Design a protein around this motif. Structure first.
Motif, mmCIF file in Angstrom:
data_model
loop_
_atom_site.group_PDB
_atom_site.id
_atom_site.type_symbol
_atom_site.label_atom_id
_atom_site.label_comp_id
_atom_site.label_asym_id
_atom_site.label_seq_id
_atom_site.Cartn_x
_atom_site.Cartn_y
_atom_site.Cartn_z
ATOM 1 N N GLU A 113 4.504 1.262 2.394
ATOM 2 C CA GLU A 113 5.609 2.034 2.858
ATOM 3 C C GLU A 113 6.782 2.455 1.376
ATOM 4 O OE1 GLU A 113 6.556 3.852 5.805
ATOM 5 O OE2 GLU A 113 4.149 2.347 6.561
ATOM 6 N N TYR A 114 5.726 2.098 0.550
ATOM 7 C CA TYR A 114 7.079 2.410 -0.811
ATOM 8 C C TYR A 114 6.161 2.989 -1.572
ATOM 9 C CZ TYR A 114 10.669 -0.765 0.593
ATOM 10 O OH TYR A 114 11.488 -1.701 1.656
ATOM 11 N N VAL A 115 5.395 3.638 -1.649
ATOM 12 C CA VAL A 115 3.901 3.859 -2.604
ATOM 13 C C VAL A 115 4.401 5.359 -2.772
ATOM 14 C CG1 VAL A 115 1.747 5.321 -3.112
ATOM 15 C CG2 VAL A 115 1.928 3.041 -1.559
ATOM 16 N N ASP A 116 5.207 6.094 -2.019
ATOM 17 C CA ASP A 116 5.968 7.429 -2.951
ATOM 18 C C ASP A 116 7.586 6.723 -3.738
ATOM 19 O OD1 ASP A 116 4.559 9.114 -0.870
ATOM 20 O OD2 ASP A 116 6.665 10.138 -0.076
ATOM 21 N N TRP A 117 7.153 6.228 -3.737
ATOM 22 C CA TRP A 117 9.029 5.511 -5.076
ATOM 23 C C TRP A 117 7.801 4.717 -5.336
ATOM 24 C CZ3 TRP A 117 9.786 0.630 -6.922
ATOM 25 C CH2 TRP A 117 11.518 0.563 -6.977
HETATM 26 NA NA NA Z 1 8.635 5.080 -0.558
#
Ligand code: NA
Ligand SMILES: NCc1cccc(-c2cccc(C(=O)Nc3ccccc3CC(=O)O)c2)c1
Length: 236
Positions: free
Chosen positions: A226-230
């Motif tokens: 859930e944090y890959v974009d970040w």
């Molecule tokens: Na993200």
């Protein structure tokens, strides 16, 4: 780690030990190598840390006793904490460390892949938590890097065990119904590594829980996917 066993050299080559150097040198938290100058860890590890000047990252370590006054380490150039982080239990417990130089990859130090794009429906059944943390609430940092296999539990089940907290899809949980195996103090920031098709992926970051290895109180981890974009935005 509660209920774990000793790891061997080269077994978890993405695992690092993050030390603070003031007012004494000691192991603070775990972390994972995710790129040539990047460690993924937990934001809560940096409570009261004045600046990156007092940090050292050691890679390729099995035993904490290996670390001597001439053991090589990486300085930390930048600590990047998620802008929504407040406290471990309230989520967003994720941080990046940018190192002062690059990590040369060998059998004892190399990156772990993030959960792959397209793998939403993958069910992870081979997950391990590692670290030099306590073996129970009243303990000390362990010498040899410990490992324990822990099953994931659904977020629905996890929320029923933590009715005073908000368990969100930015978290995942893992633990046995009767406890016995779990992360504990000193393990935060390290990986929950799951092997799928013979490739390890960094599925969770050790974050918090109620006690350590208590029955019906699974460990709560940052849900990395859930944090890959970040992560990608910060490391580009
Ligand atoms: Na993200
Ligand atoms: N089984 C769930 C579980 C998983 C991981 C850690 C614990 C746990 C237990 C008791 C005390 C603490 C603590 O004080 N942490 C801390 C606070 C500030 C900075 C660094 C840290 C180290 C860290 O978090 O590892 C953590 C419990």
């Amino acid at each position: 780690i509660v209920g774990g066993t000793a790891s061997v050299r080269g077994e978890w080559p993405w695992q690092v030990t993050l030390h603070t150097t003031s007012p004494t040198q000691r192991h603070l938290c775990g972390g994972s190598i995710i790129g040539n100058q990047w460690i993924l860890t937990a934001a809560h590890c940096f409570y009261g840390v004045e600046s990156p000047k007092i940090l050292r990252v050691y890679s390729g370590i099995l035993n904490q006793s290996e670390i001597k006054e001439d053991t090589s380490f990486f300085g930390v150039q930048e600590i990047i904490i998620h802008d929504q982080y407040k406290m471990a239990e309230s989520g967003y417990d994720i941080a990046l460390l940018k190192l002062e130089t690059t990590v040369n990859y060998t059998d004892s130090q190399r990156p772990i892949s993030l959960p792959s794009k397209g793998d939403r429906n993958v069910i992870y059944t081979d997950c391990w938590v590692t670290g030099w943390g306590y073996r129970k609430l009243r303990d000390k940092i362990q010498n040899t890097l410990q490992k324990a296999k822990i099953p994931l539990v659904t977020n629905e089940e996890c929320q029923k065990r933590y009715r005073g907290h908000k368990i969100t899809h930015k978290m995942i949980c893992a633990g046995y119904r009767e406890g016995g195996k779990d992360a504990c103090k000193g393990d935060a920031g390290g990986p929950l590594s799951c092997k799928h098709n013979e490739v390890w992926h960094l599925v969770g970051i050790t974050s918090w829980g109620e006690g350590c290895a208590q029955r019906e109180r699974p460990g709560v981890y940052t849900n990395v996917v859930e944090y890959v974009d970040w992560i990608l935005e910060k490391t580009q």
